């Protein structure tokens, strides 16, 4: 449920506590931008159809 | 005397040099690092005392001769990488 | 060339009692080079890597 | 102690003038002058200077003459023109100090106790920083060695107050580089840095060779400081750093890639817009 | 195979042509047993098909791609076999790809007996014949993709191999041929798979970005380079 | 005894009590013992607190210098059992006294914080910036000695 950041390994009977690193916003702005530019490249197609 | 890169010191090697048992190499470094003769850190799982120095010692002709021979290598690399940049970016270098 | 009669002066008496003379600066090498040091950086500069904490923030920004 | 001696642009442009005044006719070595300037917390501000008749002889290296009355009277005039300047040291364009510097410095100590001599290498125009600032200290050399006069070194930096800054900026106005840098100038900033680091390391090597070959005295101090720099190296081969370097190099490439793509789609869009432009005008011509 | 070896296809070529040459080279490469490159060119050849004009070319390429992929140990994309134009055309290959995943050799032979003759006209029967004695590879890949330390005796059970000894040559061979990334520790008969690493901390992502950025920058130059400013009228 | 608490070095409790316990607790005619550590109920509690206070300082020196000290070797160095030493560190970490992550599986008490990439290179950058400063400062000192020792 995302209560605490950890993992339960059963083969050693241990709960591996750790720290969640951020979601590195920069990559999220790039992935959103890629889709953005993916849509613009489409609208370039339509200008290309006019020839 | 470390080779620099291998700045870590296995507990055995320190205990063998000073003929001091491994249980007290842990405290010997504890002191030497306490007065200010070192700026490293101590590991126990491996018991290799990672070393970083800020306390220099007086030198010697052979020590300086040795210290300069290393530095001739260092300027050789610094020169080589400079050429590999100036030659590479001649058009852009402007 | 090098100027046209400035209005903020033509009113205070020009070509009527005082005329301007073209002003030209005799800068020569060995003087420009010593002035270039005013903002010249140094060898250390250009190899300093910025700092990554504000670089990542800047790249993200 | 003086943390810095900030030499204003006007002084190094009068010294250059001072060197030219004489060398043009009376071919001679270093031209000596007085350096005026206002004090600060510890950073001595050099704001102006003037020449002092100085004649020297290569024999005995102590048959010189630095005029006293000219130095006294000159400053008598200048404190009239501007009162924020006090005599603070001297300058000589001879790149290498002389044996006469200590004795003459003692003289200028008679006008300012904390006298700093600034060597301006007027003739050279090279890597940079044409000023080298020196003080006078007489210490027991802690580590059991003869006492002597010697010139200790003080960090020098060249700055500009507002008024001279405006004049200087126009004075170049033909070779100034863009402040933005741009990719072209930034990279040149690094080929320049590499050339220096090699050049500084080569001065270090020659001296180490000199001490290694004996031709110079093992300082026993500052000698191991160079040993300090030799331990402060990064040791990049370390695995945990090797991983952490690829992450940031990879962290940046994904931004240059996104930067590259945007510049490409814009490029294509600009050709499609242009292909329409000339074509449409092509049909519209008929 | 020679002619392509010495000849160089003009890089600045018509899309229509670039698509064609890629198929023929793919056909040649596939026969020459250079499978892995056959897929890369054929998939690239397919990508260059003139969107929707050539119902045929897309039909034949998909025919080789499905058979080419099978011989390499990869189950082809299902969205292929449902598409309108290639629906009935590739349906003959459909029964095949189902056979390979099922690994029911009896089913595989049955299809070649019936639909096999049609393959010849497509010029693929020979390639299918390679597969009939290569159906074991994929199941070796399926086992290596899911299991990470499967004991050899278990591999024999899950691939129908007759003996635990027989799998060893096949298990190694698939390991030997780079269809797997595993090491067979014969000391105790277990096919360990390679411990996968955090790639983002290694240099793989940078290299993938370089090939990307070089093309992105090149596109800018190609766009800018032509730009065809008509001689100002 | 005052100096030991300002000396940034490990101080074994058993050494301290064996060395200062008699003079402090018992006292003598020459050494007029104090009531702080007397045999009374409140005194003994203070003596437990001295063993607690001594242990904590041994922790800080452990945290300042060590990076990964095994729990047992840490137990020996505090004069506590494996379990108690675990509790005392835990009570410290919960109260934010020190930074510790007891990897109870292997008996490791790692102290160094997780190293973020932005700091790892940034620390390396700081080393280089200091090194570049040393190269200039040592160069000027070198150009100084060439001038003076003509």
């Amino acid at each position: 449920d995302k209560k605490f950041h950890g993992i339960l390994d059963q083969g050693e009977g241990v709960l591996i506590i750790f720290d969640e690193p951020p979601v590195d916003k920069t990559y999220e702005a790039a992935l959103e931008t890629i889709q953005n530019m993916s849509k613009v490249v489409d609208s370039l197609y339509n200008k290309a159809k006019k020839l | 005397t470390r080779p620099a890169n291998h700045r870590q010191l296995t507990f055995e090697e320190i205990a063998k040099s000073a003929k001091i048992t491994v249980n007290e190499v842990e405290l010997l470094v504890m002191k030497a690092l306490s007065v200010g003769l070192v700026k490293g850190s101590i590991d126990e799982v491996d018991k290799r005392v990672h070393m970083t120095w800020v306390q220099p010692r007086v030198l010697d002709l052979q020590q300086i001769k040795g210290m300069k021979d290393r530095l001739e290598f260092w300027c050789t690399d610094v020169k080589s990488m400079e050429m590999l940049v100036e030659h590479q970016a001649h058009d852009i270098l402007t | 060339h090098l100027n046209k009669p400035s209005i903020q002066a033509l009113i205070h008496g020009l070509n009527r009692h005082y005329y301007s003379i073209t002003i030209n600066y005799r800068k020569n090498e060995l003087e420009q080079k010593m002035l270039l040091n005013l903002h010249k950086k140094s060898w250390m500069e250009g190899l300093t890597l910025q700092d990554y904490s504000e670089h990542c923030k800047h790249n993200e920004s | 102690a003086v943390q810095k001696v900030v030499v204003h642009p006007l002084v190094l442009l009068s010294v250059v003038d001072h060197f030219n005044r004489i060398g043009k006719v009376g071919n001679q070595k270093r031209v000596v002058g007085v350096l005026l300037g206002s004090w600060q917390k510890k950073v001595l501000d050099v704001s102006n200077s003037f020449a002092v008749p100085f004649d020297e002889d290569d024999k005995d290296d102590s048959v010189w003459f630095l005029d006293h009355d000219y130095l006294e009277n000159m400053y008598g005039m200048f404190k009239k023109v501007n009162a924020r300047e006090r005599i603070v040291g001297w300058y000589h364009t001879g790149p290498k100090l002389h044996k006469n510097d200590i004795a003459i410095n003692e003289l200028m100590k008679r006008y300012c106790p904390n006298s700093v001599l600034v060597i301006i290498d007027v003739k050279p125009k090279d890597l940079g920083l044409p000023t080298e600032a020196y003080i006078s200290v007489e210490e027991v050399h802690d580590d059991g060695t003869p006492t002597s006069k010697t010139f200790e070194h003080v960090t020098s930096e060249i700055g500009a107050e507002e008024a001279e800054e405006v004049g200087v900026e126009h004075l170049l106005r033909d070779i100034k580089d863009t402040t933005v840098g741009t990719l072209s100038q930034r990279i040149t900033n690094q080929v320049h840095g590499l050339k220096g680091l090699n050049s500084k390391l080569l001065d270090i090597r020659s001296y180490l060779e000199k001490v290694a070959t004996g031709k110079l005295p093992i300082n026993h101090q500052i000698i191991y400081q160079l040993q300090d720099v030799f331990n402060l190296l990064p040791d990049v081969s370390l695995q945990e750093f090797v991983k952490a370097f690829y992450l940031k190099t990879n962290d940046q490439m994904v931004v240059v890639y996104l930067a590259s793509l945007i510049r490409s789609v814009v490029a294509l869009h600009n050709l499609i817009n242009n292909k329409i432009a000339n074509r449409d005008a092509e049909k519209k011509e008929g | 195979e020679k002619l392509v070896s010495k000849s160089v296809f003009p890089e600045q070529a018509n899309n229509n042509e670039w698509a064609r040459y890629l198929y023929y080279t793919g056909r040649i490469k596939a026969i020459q047993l250079e499978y892995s490159e056959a897929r890369r060119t054929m998939t690239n050849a397919l990508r260059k098909a003139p969107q929707h004009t050539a119902v045929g070319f897309k039909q034949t390429v998909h025919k080789l791609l499905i058979v080419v992929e099978l011989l390499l140990g990869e189950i082809p994309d299902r969205l292929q076999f449902r598409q309108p134009s290639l629906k009935r055309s590739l349906m003959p290959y459909f029964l095949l790809t189902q056979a390979v995943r099922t690994g029911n050799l009896a089913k595989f032979n049955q299809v070649l007996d019936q639909f096999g003759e049609k393959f010849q006209a497509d010029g693929t029967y020979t390639l299918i014949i390679r597969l009939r004695h290569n159906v074991i590879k994929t199941g070796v890949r399926m086992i290596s993709l899911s299991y990470s330390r499967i004991s050899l005796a278990d591999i024999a059970q899950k691939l129908q191999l007759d003996s635990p000894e027989d799998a060893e040559f096949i298990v190694a061979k698939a390991i030997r041929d780079g269809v797997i990334e595993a090491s067979i520790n014969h000391e105790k008969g277990y096919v360990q798979s390679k411990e996968m690493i955090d790639i983002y901390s290694t240099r793989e992502p940078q290299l993938a970005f370089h090939q990307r950025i070089s093309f992105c920058l090149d596109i800018h130059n190609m766009s800018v380079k032509a730009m065809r400013f008509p001689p100002k009228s | 005894l005052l100096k030991l608490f300002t000396t940034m070095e490990l101080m074994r409790w058993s050494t301290l009590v064996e060395d200062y316990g008699m003079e402090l607790r018992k006292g003598s005619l020459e050494s007029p013992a104090t009531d702080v550590f007397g045999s009374t109920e409140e005194g003994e509690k203070r003596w437990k607190d001295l063993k607690n206070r001594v242990v904590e300082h041994n922790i800080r020196i452990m945290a300042k210098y060590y990076t990964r000290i095994t729990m047992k070797r840490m137990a020996q160095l505090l004069d506590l059992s494996v379990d108690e030493s675990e509790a005392f560190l835990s009570n410290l970490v919960v109260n934010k006294t020190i930074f510790a992550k007891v990897d109870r599986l292997a008996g490791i008490i790692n102290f160094q914080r997780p190293k973020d990439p932005n700091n790892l290179l940034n620390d390396w950058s700081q080393k280089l910036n200091s090194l570049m400063s040393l190269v200039n400062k040592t160069t000027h000192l070198i150009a100084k000695e060439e001038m003076i020792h003509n």
Side-chain angles (χ1 to χ4, degrees):
Chain A
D1 272 312
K2 302 291 156 28
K3 304 271 62 279
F4 83 95
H5 310 276
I7 275 284
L8 257 190
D9 91 5
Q10 203 62 215
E12 296 176 0
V14 317
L15 152 61
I16 299 333
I17 303 315
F18 60 62
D19 297 338
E20 85 287 31
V23 69
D24 56 41
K25 323 322 194 320
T26 166
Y27 255 93
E28 201 140 333
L31 270 296
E32 299 176 353
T33 291
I34 294 305
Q35 268 164 338
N36 248 344
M37 283 307 81
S38 189
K39 219 172 316 303
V40 57
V41 172
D42 270 30
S43 178
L44 278 187
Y45 272 120
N46 292 336
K47 308 178 84 85
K49 295 312 331 183
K50 277 86 145 185
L51 293 163
Chain B
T1 64
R2 287 276 74 179
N5 48 30
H6 319 341
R7 31 190 49 88
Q8 324 321 336
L9 316 90
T10 278
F11 42 99
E12 298 137 6
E13 84 191 15
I14 271 169
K16 78 178 67 217
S17 299
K19 60 185 299 174
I20 202 61
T21 191
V22 278
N23 221 288
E24 321 149 358
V25 47
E26 167 153 344
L27 198 46
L28 153 56
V29 47
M30 201 45 38
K31 166 45 156 17
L33 175 41
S34 58
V35 162
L37 306 70
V38 150
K39 293 196 131 161
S41 81
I42 308 93
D43 156 20
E44 261 71 12
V45 203
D46 318 2
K47 174 44 74 161
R48 287 126 46 62
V49 153
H50 162 95
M51 186 39 69
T52 50
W53 216 319
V54 314
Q55 179 50 36
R57 72 157 79 264
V58 51
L59 263 285
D60 158 7
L61 327 179
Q62 213 54 335
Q63 314 258 109
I64 271 286
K65 186 80 63 180
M67 167 152 322
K68 73 137 294 177
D69 310 338
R70 324 188 182 298
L71 164 145
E72 182 190 28
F73 274 140
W74 185 21
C75 63
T76 278
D77 285 0
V78 86
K79 183 41 150 292
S80 146
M81 178 54 33
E82 141 193 308
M83 253 163 302
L84 191 144
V85 166
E86 47 205 335
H87 161 261
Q88 205 44 40
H90 169 49
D91 293 78
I92 164 63
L93 215 60
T94 68
Chain C
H1 302 73
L2 279 299
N3 206 334
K4 27 189 289 290
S6 34
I7 169 56
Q8 91 300 37
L10 262 38
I11 315 162
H12 294 188
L14 209 154
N15 291 163
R16 300 195 325 178
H17 16 212
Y18 69 57
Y19 58 121
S20 85
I21 315 178
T22 61
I23 211 54
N24 166 8
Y25 312 81
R26 254 266 299 298
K27 55 193 163 337
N28 61 16
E29 263 206 329
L30 176 58
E31 271 166 330
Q32 307 196 358
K33 301 275 181 310
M34 201 95 68
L35 296 214
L36 268 149
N37 302 144
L38 200 166
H39 294 342
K40 185 260 282 170
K41 317 213 180 273
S42 42
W43 80 286
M44 34 199 74
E45 192 66 331
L47 283 171
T48 326
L49 307 133
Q50 196 156 212
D51 157 12
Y52 283 113
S53 267
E54 92 287 9
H55 193 238
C56 195
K57 273 161 25 80
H58 167 276
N59 253 27
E60 159 182 309
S61 154
Chain D
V2 282
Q3 65 173 110
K4 267 177 13 200
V5 154
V6 291
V7 171
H8 281 197
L10 168 49
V11 46
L12 48 80
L13 180 71
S14 175
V15 158
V16 157
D17 208 23
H18 172 206
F19 196 44
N20 289 343
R21 305 185 201 179
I22 300 286
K24 167 185 48 198
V25 283
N27 166 279
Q28 181 43 285
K29 204 68 195 62
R30 65 206 289 216
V31 288
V32 180
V34 169
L35 296 170
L36 304 123
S38 94
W39 244 107
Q40 262 303 0
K41 294 63 196 148
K42 284 255 281 196
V43 317
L44 168 52
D45 259 33
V46 177
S47 201
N48 223 325
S49 146
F50 55 87
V52 284
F54 177 106
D55 198 338
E56 220 182 324
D57 189 315
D58 49 276
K59 304 327 198 86
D60 307 81
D61 60 73
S62 289
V63 191
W64 56 274
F65 186 22
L66 185 151
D67 194 310
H68 268 298
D69 306 318
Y70 189 143
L71 185 151
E72 270 187 12
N73 264 17
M74 191 56 38
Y75 177 73
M77 293 230 197
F78 273 63
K79 173 151 49 44
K80 195 189 320 301
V81 152
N82 204 338
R84 189 145 319 279
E85 305 152 62
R86 281 252 291 97
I87 318 185
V88 309
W90 59 307
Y91 72 84
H92 58 111
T93 89
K96 298 321 165 207
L97 299 155
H98 295 45
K99 210 181 296 329
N100 252 353
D101 322 326
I102 269 303
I104 275 165
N105 192 30
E106 290 295 18
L107 181 146
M108 226 67 58
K109 303 193 58 64
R110 174 181 331 301
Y111 293 80
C112 192
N114 273 68
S115 147
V116 58
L117 91 82
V118 152
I119 294 180
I120 309 206
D121 43 22
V122 85
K123 271 191 168 184
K125 305 161 266 330
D126 37 353
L127 196 72
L129 219 59
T131 78
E132 191 46 10
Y134 292 160
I135 322 183
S136 165
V137 290
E138 213 80 0
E139 85 158 12
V140 313
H141 314 74
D142 165 32
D143 294 346
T145 278
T147 180
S148 158
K149 314 285 283 152
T150 284
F151 287 73
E152 164 255 341
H153 157 83
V154 46
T155 281
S156 163
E157 172 278 331
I158 283 269
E161 157 267 351
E162 170 61 352
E164 323 162 59
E165 181 37 32
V166 86
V168 169
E169 170 49 5
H170 166 289
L171 208 184
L172 296 197
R173 186 41 60 57
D174 60 22
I175 51 185
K176 192 74 133 180
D177 304 350
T178 74
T179 72
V180 301
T182 70
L183 247 201
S184 319
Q185 318 174 331
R186 306 279 312 190
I187 310 286
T188 313
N189 197 165
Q190 309 199 138
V191 151
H192 180 31
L194 270 286
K195 231 169 271 282
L197 172 46
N198 172 11
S199 167
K200 261 41 171 162
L201 270 192
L202 273 198
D203 289 353
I204 293 200
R205 187 185 74 60
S206 92
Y207 161 76
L208 259 287
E209 185 173 35
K210 286 315 193 334
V211 201
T213 207
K215 298 170 183 173
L216 225 64
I218 316 144
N219 274 125
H220 161 46
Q221 60 51 26
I222 306 313
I223 165 160
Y224 48 49
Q225 161 195 96
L226 177 159
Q227 177 185 8
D228 196 346
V229 86
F230 222 103
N231 96 321
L232 199 53
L233 291 180
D235 186 11
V236 309
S237 288
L238 184 33
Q239 263 300 132
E240 191 285 341
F241 166 99
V242 176
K243 301 141 191 166
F245 179 79
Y246 283 128
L247 172 156
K248 291 262 56 187
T249 293
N250 269 290
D251 221 286
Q252 296 155 344
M253 274 320 122
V254 86
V255 86
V256 178
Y257 167 42
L258 178 45
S260 64
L261 183 155
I262 279 272
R263 165 175 150 141
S264 147
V265 173
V266 152
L268 257 190
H269 160 285
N270 202 328
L271 169 80
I272 279 200
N273 186 338
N274 171 273
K275 216 54 76 146
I276 297 174
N278 65 62
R279 186 68 213 208
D280 172 11
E282 194 281 339
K283 286 317 305 191
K284 177 218 53 55
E285 158 266 342
Chain E
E1 194 281 340
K2 301 315 194 63
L3 165 56
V4 310
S5 186
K6 325 328 307 175
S7 58
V8 61
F9 196 12
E11 165 58 57
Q12 88 315 326
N14 160 344
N15 268 309
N16 244 336
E17 299 302 1
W18 243 124
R20 246 159 169 263
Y21 158 76
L22 291 176
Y23 163 40
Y24 290 118
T25 168
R27 187 34 179 288
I28 275 302
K29 270 325 207 299
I31 284 307
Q32 304 289 319
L33 201 184
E34 306 198 21
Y35 282 118
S36 167
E37 250 300 354
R39 191 218 323 181
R40 205 279 279 161
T41 307
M42 281 215 68
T43 278
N44 202 69
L46 191 63
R47 194 151 51 51
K48 199 65 51 63
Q51 170 49 227
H52 181 278
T53 326
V55 168
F57 176 22
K58 271 181 283 196
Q59 286 176 350
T60 279
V61 163
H62 276 266
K63 287 189 173 187
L64 195 40
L65 202 47
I66 279 172
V67 182
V68 156
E69 269 196 0
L70 275 160
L71 292 155
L72 204 30
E74 300 185 7
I75 316 295
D77 183 10
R78 155 42 71 70
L79 293 92
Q80 277 172 354
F81 304 64
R82 91 161 311 179
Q83 302 215 340
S85 59
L86 332 175
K87 181 192 174 185
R88 173 185 301 180
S89 66
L90 267 150
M91 167 306 308
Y93 304 70
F94 188 120
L95 321 195
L96 210 48
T97 207
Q98 207 159 7
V100 175
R101 180 174 48 85
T102 57
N104 183 350
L105 50 99
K107 286 183 172 302
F108 185 96
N109 317 346
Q110 147 197 334
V111 179
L112 330 173
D113 310 340
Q114 163 164 340
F115 286 75
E117 163 292 307
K118 150 70 140 51
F119 300 152
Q120 266 166 21
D122 309 41
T124 300
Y125 201 96
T126 86
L127 280 157
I128 308 294
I129 282 297
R130 303 222 201 106
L131 204 87
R132 155 131 184 77
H133 286 240
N134 189 217
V135 178
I136 208 48
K137 177 163 73 281
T138 279
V140 179
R141 203 171 80 52
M142 297 265 154
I143 284 327
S144 95
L145 184 140
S146 63
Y147 296 57
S148 81
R149 186 174 303 180
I150 175 178
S151 170
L152 307 164
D154 276 356
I155 271 180
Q157 196 275 106
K158 259 182 145 253
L159 270 54
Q160 322 222 293
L161 301 192
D162 46 28
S163 83
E165 306 76 7
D166 180 18
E168 267 225 358
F169 300 126
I170 209 52
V171 176
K173 176 64 168 303
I175 271 180
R176 191 194 67 98
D177 303 7
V179 178
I180 296 333
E181 275 331 286
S183 313
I184 279 182
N185 160 6
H186 210 307
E187 311 183 7
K188 73 181 65 61
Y190 86 81
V191 189
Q192 175 75 19
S193 303
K194 182 169 188 58
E195 55 283 356
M196 164 30 47
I197 331 172
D198 179 7
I199 205 50
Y200 199 65
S201 211
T202 310
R203 185 190 191 271
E204 167 170 353
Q206 195 295 336
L207 219 36
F209 288 139
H210 174 23
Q211 333 211 345
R212 214 69 44 73
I213 277 180
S214 211
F215 169 114
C216 293
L217 293 168
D218 171 292
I219 280 304
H220 164 278
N221 292 327
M222 272 179 342
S223 101
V224 161
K225 91 92 177 182
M227 199 45 144
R228 190 38 27 69
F229 253 121
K232 169 48 187 53
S233 63
Chain F
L1 154 69
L2 177 52
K3 83 169 307 193
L4 271 178
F5 277 51
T6 313
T7 65
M8 301 304 257
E9 289 192 19
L10 271 43
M11 88 194 228
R12 285 220 61 171
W13 173 260
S14 298
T15 300
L16 164 151
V17 172
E18 166 153 308
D19 225 328
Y20 293 56
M22 197 320 301
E23 185 288 13
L24 292 176
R25 306 213 67 192
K26 305 306 297 298
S28 190
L29 166 145
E30 35 275 53
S31 57
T34 34
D35 54 9
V36 190
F37 294 136
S39 301
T40 69
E41 136 60 10
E42 40 276 5
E44 271 278 335
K45 161 170 95 124
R46 293 143 209 151
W47 184 240
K48 256 159 168 14
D49 277 11
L50 201 36
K51 160 63 165 312
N52 270 357
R53 274 311 171 281
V54 152
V55 168
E56 274 167 24
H57 159 87
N58 234 359
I59 280 296
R60 260 167 298 108
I61 306 323
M62 261 175 178
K64 273 154 270 283
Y65 296 6
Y66 285 18
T67 60
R68 298 209 338 280
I69 166 179
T70 62
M71 178 99 80
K72 64 212 161 303
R73 193 37 214 269
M74 190 197 192
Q76 264 171 19
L77 298 215
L78 287 175
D79 289 340
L80 308 202
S81 80
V82 180
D83 305 15
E84 331 155 78
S85 36
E86 211 286 339
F88 202 160
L89 184 33
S90 44
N91 185 317
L92 279 186
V93 200
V94 188
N95 290 359
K96 308 312 210 184
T97 303
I98 89 159
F99 179 108
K101 279 324 183 285
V102 277
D103 206 325
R104 209 163 147 299
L105 205 30
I108 312 166
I109 295 193
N110 159 348
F111 292 79
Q112 85 271 50
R113 304 222 169 106
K115 296 229 74 180
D116 40 343
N118 260 248
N119 154 16
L120 215 179
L121 299 176
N122 203 46
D123 156 48
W124 155 55
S125 172
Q126 288 307 354
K127 272 159 70 212
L128 286 193
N129 264 315
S130 166
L131 178 152
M132 258 161 302
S133 280
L134 255 287
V135 172
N136 237 333
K137 284 163 41 43
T138 292
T139 279
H140 297 320
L141 270 274
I142 275 173
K144 201 197 58 63
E145 310 301 9
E146 180 53 291
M147 296 247 172
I148 309 282
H149 207 104
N150 202 356

